[PDB]
Every structure is written in structure tokens, then in C-alpha cells.
Amino acid sequence: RQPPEEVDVLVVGAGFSGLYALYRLRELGRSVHVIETAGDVGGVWYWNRYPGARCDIESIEYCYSFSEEVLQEWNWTERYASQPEILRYINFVADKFDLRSGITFHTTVTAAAFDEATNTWTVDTNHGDRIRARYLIMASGQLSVPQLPNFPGLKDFAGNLYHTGNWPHEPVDFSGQRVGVIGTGSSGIQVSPQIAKQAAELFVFQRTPHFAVPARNAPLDPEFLADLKKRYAEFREESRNTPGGTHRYQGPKSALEVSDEELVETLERYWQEGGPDILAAYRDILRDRDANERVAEFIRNKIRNTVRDPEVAERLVPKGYPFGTKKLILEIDYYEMFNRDNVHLVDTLSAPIETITPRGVRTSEREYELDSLVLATGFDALTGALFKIDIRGVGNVALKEKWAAGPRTYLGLSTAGFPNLFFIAGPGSPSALSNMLVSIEQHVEWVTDHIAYMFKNGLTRSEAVLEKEDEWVEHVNEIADETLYPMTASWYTGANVPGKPRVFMLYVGGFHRYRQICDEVAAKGYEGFVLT
Ligand SMILES: Cc1cc2nc3c(=O)[nH]c(=O)nc-3n(C[C@H](O)[C@H](O)[C@H](O)COP(=O)(O)OP(=O)(O)OC[C@H]3O[C@@H](n4cnc5c(N)ncnc54)[C@H](O)[C@@H]3O)c2cc1C
Ligand SMILES: NC(=O)c1ccc[n+]([C@@H]2O[C@H](COP(=O)([O-])OP(=O)(O)OC[C@H]3O[C@@H](n4cnc5c(N)ncnc54)[C@H](OP(=O)(O)O)[C@@H]3O)[C@@H](O)[C@H]2O)c1
Numbered sequence: 438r439q440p441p442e443e444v445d446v447l448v449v450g451a452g453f454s455g456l457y458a459l460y461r462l463r464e465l466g467r468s469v470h471v472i473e474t475a476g477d478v479g480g481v482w483y484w485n486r487y488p489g490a491r492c493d494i495e496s497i498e499y500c501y502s503f504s505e506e507v508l509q510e511w512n513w514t515e516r517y518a519s520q521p522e523i524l525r526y527i528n529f530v531a532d533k534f535d536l537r538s539g540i541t542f543h544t545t546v547t548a549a550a551f552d553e554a555t556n557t558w559t560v561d562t563n564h565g566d567r568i569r570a571r572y573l574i575m576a577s578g579q580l581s582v583p584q585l586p587n588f589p590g591l592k593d594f595a596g597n598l599y600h601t602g603n604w605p606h607e608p609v610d611f612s613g614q615r616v617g618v619i620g621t622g623s624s625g626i627q628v629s630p631q632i633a634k635q636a637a638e639l640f641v642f643q644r645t646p647h648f649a650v651p652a653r654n655a656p657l658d659p660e661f662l663a664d665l666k667k668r669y670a671e672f673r674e675e676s677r678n679t680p681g682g683t684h685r686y687q688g689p690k691s692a693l694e695v696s697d698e699e700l701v702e703t704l705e706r707y708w709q710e711g712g713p714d715i716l717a718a719y720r721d722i723l724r725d726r727d728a729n730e731r732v733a734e735f736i737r738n739k740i741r742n743t744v745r746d747p748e749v750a751e752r753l754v755p756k757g758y759p760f761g762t763k764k765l766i767l768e769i770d771y772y773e774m775f776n777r778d779n780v781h782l783v784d785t786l787s788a789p790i791e792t793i794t795p796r797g798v799r800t801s802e803r804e805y806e807l808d809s810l811v812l813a814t815g816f817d818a819l820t821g822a823l824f825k826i827d828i829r830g831v832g833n834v835a836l837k838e839k840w841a842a843g844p845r846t847y848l849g850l851s852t853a854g855f856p857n858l859f860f861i862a863g864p865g866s867p868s869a870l871s872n873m874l875v876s877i878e879q880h881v882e883w884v885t886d887h888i889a890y891m892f893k894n895g896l897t898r899s900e901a902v903l904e905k906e907d908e909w910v911e912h913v914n915e916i917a918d919e920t921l922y923p924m925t926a927s928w929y930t931g932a933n934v935p936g937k938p939r940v941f942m943l944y945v946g947g948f949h950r951y952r953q954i955c956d957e958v959a960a961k962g963y964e965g966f967v968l969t
Contacts, residue, residue: 440541440566444470447560447570449546452480454576454861457881459539465889471540478531480578482523486604488631490520493767494872498683502673509666517654548827556897572888573858579869582821585812590793597809601628611635614808617798623766625813630774639780640805646755648736649766653711680947682875685717692719692728704735716761723761723920733760743772752784758925818928819864819942830855843940847901847909847965856900859884864942865913871948879952898969905965917941
């Protein structure tokens with residue numbers, strides 16, 4: 438499917454963000470096309486096919502609300518949609534509104550330059566395509582460029598090498614093999630208990646132990662669902678007016694103010710129920726390092742109470758960083774896994790990896806023989822995908838350069854000096870600190886209403902104001918700084934990628950507030966933008 442030479446709005450990416458952009462611009466009467474590297478729709482859920490892949494936000498929440506038809510017809514099956522089912526949903530949504538005729542697949546965008554002469558962007562691909570668009574929507578994701586560490590012997594490994602984020606399309610057989618996994622972020626924790634069932638040995642290469650809590654996944658009762666459907670927009674609307682974009686109860690109490698007996702009884706109740714909801718058990722879990730510690734420790738005794746070898750258990754216990762400052766992971770049978778004879782924890786904090794060999798992984802302590810090695814080493818996050826593209830603004834300024842000391846944006850949506858360009862659900866915004874559907878819907882709607890507003894008013898150049906951008910970056914940092922978020926090396930902060938600026942990259946005031954700010958801005962004629 439050839440891309441058009443000329444288009445009102447060009448969209449990069451056909452995951453959730455891109456598809457909505459496409460749908461909406463068409464609804465608004467604008468011409469619009471999508472360029473996507475993948476072979477089909479899906480984005481993260483197309484790429485991440487490792488066995489176990491599964492959302493951490495509940496199925497009833499992690500979905501589109503923009504269409505009534507879709508809420509009424511689609512039927513989710515479990516509390517947490519596995520990867521194949523979310524893919525199925527996205528294909529369902531693709532068909533329904535005939536989105537594929539808007540999309541060139543197998544094509545990567547490689548450069549994009551703004552031409553002040555004509556207020557347009559000109560966009561280039563590895564297929565040689567060149568597109569002229571008035572507006573450029575980058576919907577190219579938050580976690581979309583796989584981060585494989587440059588472990589010294591990587592290219593010499595004689596076995597099979599994987600990355601969870603670029604997973605093969607046919608199912609991989611690990612039966613009888615010695616398998617290692619590096620990384621115990623949630624990919625690692627999700628993929629490992631699956632490989633453990635097939636492998637003769639599983640070696641789990643852990644560095645910083647992350648906090649995970651049980652998911653308590655269950656079947657979803659068709660009755661619950663049917664009741665839900667009657668009141669569905671009302672439900673999403675409730676979700677939309679929360680810090681997190683989902684139905685978390687926001688605990689009024691401070692975790693220091695309660696007694697021991699009430700704390701344990703509270704948290705036990707969260708632990709039986711499962712889910713990320715513990716995160717907001719007490720209003721100060723992310724604000725005060727002592728409040729934090731009272732919750733963390735409770736989790737830590739859980740780990741020590743689930744793992745039968747008390748030495749391995751201690752190795753598994755999260756240390757060194759505040760609870761919740763790394764993405765809090767939902768585990769299904771990850772800890773019980775280590776009770777199996779064929780599962781082994783390699784603590785690379787205490788024995789670091791020296792090199793990959795052709796037979797396996799060498800630490801300072803021993804060499805581990807492996808047929809396969811799986812990299813759950815995460816993603817060059819938030820900026821990665823933009824950075825792989827040579828984006829050029831007014832004065833021929835590289836985006837890569839303007840952003841070399843960290844992302845600089847006004848509301849995350851735009852960056853001054855690069856008019857007519859927008860970033861869906863990324864730095865300087867709520868992004869992954871919330872149910873991403875909610876964050877993605879608001880950004881698609883806000884941006885595309887914006888474009889329609891430029892067209893209804895016969896305008897052609899929309900650009901953020903330098904002072905307002907600076908005032909936004911300062912604000913993001915200032916408020917991040919009253920949380921424990923900047924205290925740890927997480928991908929939120931860039932520190933997972935050696936050399937990458939460590940700045941906490943996201944808006945932490947919560948979805949709801951960020952939307953209001955965005956509505957106040959839009960209502961005033963898009964204050965902090967200069968439209969001509
Ligand atoms: C394994 C995993 C699970 C997730 N689970 C959750 C969850 O629990 N809760 C939640 O809220 N969200 C979750 N996320 C976050 C996730 O990023 C969002 O939920 C959402 O799927 C991102 O959608 P998107 O359209 O914004 O970006 P993506 O789905 O990443 O789509 C971006 C697309 O753009 C394409 N692209 C990038 N560069 C180019 C290029 N130059 N040329 C052409 N195409 C390009 C990519 O191929 C990709 O398909 C998860 C992320 C991962 C990695
Ligand atoms: N169920 C879900 O919702 C889900 C699933 C997957 C991903 N995601 C999203 O995408 C993010 C990515 O998570 P992820 O599982 O892909 O990975 P991640 O959270 O980035 O963690 C990567 C893991 O690899 C380790 N690591 C990185 N570089 C290393 C090196 N050079 N040597 C040894 N270990 C190294 C890290 O150890 P250290 O932490 O100590 O550096 C960490 O264990 C998640 O936090 C979440 O936002 C969500």
C-alpha cells in the first residue's frame with residue numbers, strides 16, 4: 438500500500454495511538470495516512486509476543502472508549518488481557534473502521550524536516566517514500582525501541598538470542614533447553630514462569646530486584662461484564678477523573694500515621710485482592726521515604742514468606758530504591774517458580790556479568806552453559822524511537838540535539854522550534870504513569886481537535902512558545918522532585934541506557950490535573966502556542 442505524496446496529517450505508528458489519530462482525523466474531514474515499521478497493526482502488542490505477555494491494567498480499563506459500538510460488542514475474558522487477546526481487540530478495531538487502507542506497513546520513517554517556506558513537514562522512509570504533510574503526529578510509542586545491553590561477547594553467542602520486545606511470530610520451543618533470562622523487569626517476570634515450564638534449566642539473571650505483587654488474575658464473569666456495558670461511558674468517565682486513569686482507591690491516610698496492626702491488615706487486604714492498587718494505599722508512599730519503607734518492608738516479608746530457600750529469597754528482596762519508583766510489576770507465580778528444582782537465580786549484583794561467551798554467560802564467579810538466551814532488558818524509553826529518526830526543525834535544529842540534556846516540551850505535546858509536530862503520550866506528560874489508553878485518548882483528541890481548529894480558522898503554523906516550554910520543563914522537574922521518583926535508576930529517568938541523560942521524564946501530577954491544564958490551554962485559544 439503506497440503512501441500518498443501529500444497529506445494534511447501524517448502519523449507515525451499503528452499501535453493504539455496511531456490508529457485513533459487516523460480514525461479521528463478522518464472523522465474530522467482531514468486527509469490522513471500512517472507509516473508503520475511493523476507488518477500489521479498493534480504496536481507494543483504486535484512486537485511483544487513473548488509467552489506470558491499480559492497487561493497490568495485491568496481489561497475493562499485498558500481499552501478504547503471513543504466508540505460506543507466497540508464497548509458494547511467486544512468481550513474481554515480475564516481481569517488481565519493476555520497479549521494475543523489485546524492483539525485480537527486491536528485487529529477487531531482495525532477492521533471495524535477500515536483503518537488499514539490508511540496505513541503503509543513495513544516502512545520505517547528515517548528523516549523528517551520542517552520547511553518554514555511552506556509551513557509543512559517533509560517525511561522520508563527507508564523505502565524511498567517522501568511525504569509532504571502539514572502536521573506531523575509522532576505516535577511511535579514509549580517503549581518501542583528494544584534495549585539490548587552491549588554485553589561484551591554478545592555477537593559470539595552460538596545459541597539462540599531473543600529480545601522480548603522483538604519476539605518471533607511463530608511460538609518458540611524451549612523444551613529440554615538450558616535457558617537464561619537477563620532482566621527481571623516485568624517482561625522478565627512475565628516470560629520466566631512460562632519458560633520455566635519447558636526449559637531443562639532456567640537461569641534468571643537478576644540485577645536490581647524489582648517489586649512485584651500478585652496479579653490475582655481471574656476469569657471475568659459474563660454477568661459482571663454485561664452490567665458493566667449498561668453503565669460503560671459513565672465508568673470510563675470515572676476512570677478519566679483520577680490521577681491514574683483507572684479505578685484505584687486513593688488512600689486518605691498517611692502510612693506513618695497508622696499503627697502496625699492497621700497497616701498489616703490494610704496491606705494484607707490489598708495483597709489478597711491483587712493488582713497495582715497497593716501503590717496508593719497511603720497518600721505518602723511516593724512522597725516520604727519513611728512512609729515508603731513501611732510498605733516496602735511488608736512486601737519484603739511476603740517475598741521471604743513465599744520462597745522456601747531463605748538464601749535465594751533474600752536475593753530476591755528489593756533493596757536500594759523506594760517502593761513504586763521503578764514500575765511496580767504484577768507477578769503470576771514468579772516467586773513460587775524459584776521453588777522448582779530447575780529454576781536458578783543468578784544474582785548479578787553480587788556476581789556481575791563479565792562477558793557473553795559462545796556457550797553462555799560468564800560472571801565473575803562461573804560460566805553458564807546455554808542453548809538460548811532471552812533479553813528482558815527493557816527499552817530505550819520515551820526518546821528512543823524519535824531519536825532513531827533524523828528530525829529537523831526551524832533553523833535545521835536536530836530534535837536529538839535540542840533534547841540532548843533530556844526531553845524539552847510544552848505539555849509534552851510539542852517542542853518550541855518544531856512547529857506542527859506532536860508527540861502522543863510521551864515525555865513531559867502523564868504517559869505511562871497512567872492507564873495508557875486514557876493518556877493516549879486524551880492526547881489524540883486534544884491534538885486532532887487542535888488540527889481541526891487550525892483548519893477551521895485558515896491557520897497553518899502552530900508552534901509552542903520558548904518561555905512556556907521552559908516554564909513547563911521547570912514545572913515537570915520541580916514536581917517530580919517532591920516525589921521519590923527521581924531517586925532511582927529507572928527507564929522513566931533514562932538511567933537504564935548508558936550515556937543517556939538522567940532526568941525524570943514524565944508528568945507526575947496525575948492524569949486528571951494534566952487534562953485540566955490541557956483543557957484550560959485549549960479553551961483560551963491554545964495559550965502558550967503561537968498560531969499563524
Ligand atoms: C510489554 C509491554 C506491555 C505494556 N503493558 C501496559 C500496561 O500494562 N498498561 C498500560 O497502560 N500500557 C502498557 N504498556 C505501555 C504501552 O507503550 C502503551 O500501553 C501503548 O501500547 C503504547 O501505544 P502507542 O501507540 O502509544 O505506542 P506503540 O504501541 O509502541 O506503537 C508505536 C508504533 O510505532 C512504530 N514506530 C516507531 N518508530 C517508527 C518509525 N520510524 N517508522 C515507522 N514506525 C515506527 C512502532 O513500530 C510501533 O508499532 C506496555 C508496554 C510494553 C512494552
Ligand atoms: N505487564 C506489563 O504491564 C509490562 C510488561 C513489560 C513491560 N512493560 C512496560 O515497559 C517497561 C519495560 O519493562 P521491561 O520488562 O521491558 O524491562 P525494564 O523494566 O527496563 O527492566 C529491564 C531489566 O533488565 C535489567 N538490565 C538492564 N540492563 C542490564 C544490564 N546491562 N545488565 C544486567 N541487567 C540489566 C534491569 O536490571 P536493573 O533494574 O537493575 O537495571 C531490569 O531487570 C515496564 O516497566 C513497563 O513500563 C509493562
